[PDB]
Symmetry: C4
Subunit: 336 residues, 4 copies
């Protein structure tokens, strides 16, 4: 059990208990961290226009992601090597997701195997985040493992031909196959739409393009037969000076013309952030850093607590805005 009542409290506690180099690795954005600040600031510029007297006695937060039911439109995003935050790492995370009835996106650079996570969370909704590695044999092996171990989708990260320049990591230096050296050597900078065609042919699993920021790229992902877009700037860790994901979301929703689900990550810290993303047409949002702060506090119980805080904040935001369920969250609730 100190008393942590919002996501910011979990971050402040994590700073107090993590070694500075580990806290800095988790916290940091690219270069001058303009986008890191904007992912949060942009949510505040979108104002809520709540409806009164709707009857919100029995708020229902449940929705579906790529045809699978979830308890809430708030899911765990991929964050590499969770065992740095807590000894149980990804196993703690999947156990919390199982408890909450939400989905976990497992990093393909995890400190737990695809099989181990599936064995720890057999009833959990689980997706695999994938890089198309220079080694296409190990890429293929991960997708086959995901299929065999009951994972329900592939999130292919498309914004990382190279790793971003996070200054604190350079100052501090530095389980399915840790230093930026070895990761940089593994990731293929040549990845093209031809490689998306190869991945689409490799699996019948739903594939989501993670890291799209342009309407024209979203349209190309639909044309390649992908099943969703995760509007993401990689938590502002790749190219600094890109827009906030909440500011780009409306463009992407407009561009895909309802053909695939659109998701958002980047800067989600509060229930009102979730409400604004759904009002602008996202099906669900993903959280990265909040999950790591949960792990740092108390492993599985810490992740469960973070997810329960976001769930309760989202329920209250829905109720106060006059929304009894996610289907009645509409564009007129928000204006910038």
């Amino acid at each position: 059990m100190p008393r942590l009542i919002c996501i910011n409290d979990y971050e402040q506690h994590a700073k107090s208990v993590l070694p500075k180099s580990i806290y800095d690795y988790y916290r940091s954005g690219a270069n001058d961290e303009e986008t890191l600040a904007d992912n949060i600031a942009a949510f505040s510029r979108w104002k809520l226009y709540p409806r009164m007297l709707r009857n919100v006695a029995e708020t229902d937060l449940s929705t579906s992601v790529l045809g699978q039911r979830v308890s809430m439109p708030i899911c765990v995003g991929a964050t590499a090597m969770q065992r740095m935050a807590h000894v149980d790492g990804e196993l703690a995370t999947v156990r919390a997701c199982q408890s909450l009835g939400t989905g976990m996106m497992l990093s393909s650079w995890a400190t737990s195997s695809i099989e181990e996570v599936a064995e720890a969370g057999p009833e959990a909704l689980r997706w695999l985040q994938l890089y198309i590695y220079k080694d296409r044999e190990v890429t293929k092996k991960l997708v086959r493992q995901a299929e065999k171990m009951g994972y329900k989708a592939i999130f292919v990260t498309v914004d990382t031909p190279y790793l971003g320049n996070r200054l604190d990591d350079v100052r501090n230096r530095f389980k399915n196959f840790g230093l930026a050296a070895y990761v940089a050597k593994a990731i293929d900078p040549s990845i093209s739409w031809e490689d998306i065609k190869w991945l689409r042919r490799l699996t019948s699993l739903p594939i989501v393009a993670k890291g799209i920021l342009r309407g024209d790229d979203a349209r190309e992902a639909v044309k390649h037969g992908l099943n969703g877009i995760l509007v993401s700037n990689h938590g502002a860790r790749q190219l600094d000076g890109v827009p906030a994901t909440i500011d780009v979301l409306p463009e992407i929703v407009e561009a895909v013309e309802g053909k695939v689900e659109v998701f958002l990550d980047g800067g989600v810290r509060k229930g009102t952030d979730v409400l604004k993303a759904l009002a602008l047409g996202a099906k669900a949002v993903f959280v990265g850093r909040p999950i790591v702060w949960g792990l740092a506090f108390q492993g599985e119980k810490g992740v469960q607590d973070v997810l329960e805080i976001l769930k309760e904040e989202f329920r209250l935001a829905m109720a106060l805005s006059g929304c009894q369920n996610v289907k009645v969250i509409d564009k007129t609730l928000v204006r910038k």
Copy 2:
């Protein structure tokens, strides 16, 4: 008698004399308090365009609220359990309103009975703020008591299906029928326009919808036969990230097409704030926190002093803007 010459001085004095938990309860907004800051910041963005050489020798501040004459378009808003600020609580407040010739809105969660307040301020203009409680029998009893004890209107609060998440109250924990537990258990989250129809049938008293932020909700309140709209975000204590009330006011005034009076609360601290609200079409404004700071300073004399400061600031703002009376305050005085 320290020397307090503006409303901010009263707040700073209240911080110095109140226990931190009580000051924090009064001061706080919801969650990250974005709207709390914006209720004040938004007034500064509206600029005044004063007329010169009008003859403002005999400035007349008097107006009417729902057909009842008042000395100034500045009235006391509902604030629960005033006896926390001063031993005399609501009785101090109503005695000050009687002295000033303005109206008092009594919280239905007051530390003085409807009868006690009416006995302390028999000549005061008095209104009852109402929640539609899960217990409709006690709701009915309050309205009947208001009628019998010479209250002139019902302000039905419509923005509180649940209580907002004020973080300091969670950190500090915690007379007509005190802990958020007991209040949360009393308030009905199922309240709908059907319950407004029931209230409209229950009383011939004028009814004002308190907490409307959307033009479409304002139009529905007119269609239900209500007699006014109080444009309010509950002092930024309910849903955080809603607009400032002064920014929403023009939309609501436009939407009701002169069919009912429109009032404002939220962030009123200065005479120029009152002038801007009337220029944008509000009939009168309500003050919440300033009254509590008055009580904390010196009970009845403190409330009288706060109200006299706002009156004098408003008279000077009117005179310097070329307005001899409230009927000549027009839209051309302000631009954002």
Copy 3:
């Protein structure tokens, strides 16, 4: 002779040598001082678009105010009771204006008589600032004295039916006929366009309306046969929350359609401020507080130094913007 090289240096020195109550009286704006900050901030939002390769070898700063030649479009504005800043007060100021070849506007609430100032600066361009006092006999006497003693215009202040609420003056409490009490008792709040008609009939001297912020009021001043508009918010000391004078200037210039000269005061501290005001169509600007800071430093020599700093800054701003004289300063030099 410390080394003061810009107007801000003179203010910082004045703070160091004046009693706090006197510094605060000079520095202060009305209420929360929003307009005080904006008079300066607004100049920074107007950006300069300099022309290159014009030939600025022999920059000529000279212009005319109401038909009288001046060395530069930078004149001394009225500031009451200059003897608080320096023993020589208004006599020091007029001697500096005589040296510079610019005009002095004498406050009608001066610590030197109209005759004394005329005797100290017989060759100086001198104007009288006038309030229409409740006592019209003493108002008439001031205008007749101005005429007899070789003053070239009347600036009638029209934004002061009452004195503004400057909070520091209230905290600190407190020669042609000192406490706000006595000044408040002297100034007529009934002044109307009828009183402007009376003043226009009283003198053939040029009359400038000082304190106009609306185009419609500027047009009425032209219709009443006045000879100029001084766009002024009284150094942000009257109604707080009015716009910056530089932001209102274009509206007023447009409204008078070239029929009378338009002047500006409020926030002029730098040569680029003068250039921006002339680019937006002002004939000349007036400085209030900078002159008091000059007096506080070294009386006549201090005022001369402040005026010489503004002159040199303005010459450099003209030269770097490609303007050899004031007639070639045009609207295309600035954009907001």
Copy 4:
């Protein structure tokens, strides 16, 4: 070899090792330094819209400046008297440019002769920055020396009829022919388009107009047969309150209608700044202060390190934005 990993680190190190008066001379902008702050802030307002899945395995940074190949669109701008920063001054700078395969613009107020710099960097791409001095004989001699010693262009500075007012230089006081006195006496304030005609007739070398901020001036430079425009506010050291160069660039690119190359300097500190300038139509950018900070750290090795940091940041920005070469950097990558 402290560990400096970005340009800001080099500045902070230079502040620690340079005498305050020298650091202040290098750092300072004109007057209140509004433009100094805006040259940097303006880059942050331009947001990047990266393309994904392009194949950026073999990023090629090479381009051409005025027909000469360079390794990257990042060149060294003219900064007077580099020997104040390091004993080797301009010879250190040209040796670093030779190593990098980029161009050096040599100040005509250098602490090394045109011949000495050419002898130190015989293989380096070298340009001469020129003032048209009151002494046209020495102006002619510099151009003839540039021609003879294998310099490939003249950058004629057109924004300096007089030197800007940098306040710190006034507080601190103070090799082809040091005090502002002697420089002020040398520079001709009469320079006109007639003098540009004279310079165009004097040399067949390409001539770039350095310091243009207006589209109409850019068009006149094209009409006079000049070969490029360097959009520059002289590192915010001349007229304060001009726009940021990145904000003026689109106007200038539009105005010249592809007739000549357009370059930018002012506020370039990061690879994303270079990318934004090229996306808005600049051929290349110049850096001033970063080179001086390199010299202050470790002479030639320090300049090489600064240039290598900008090169690597630019390569990563190109790769993450989906640009394999400079020819595919287009207007759709940026929005303000």
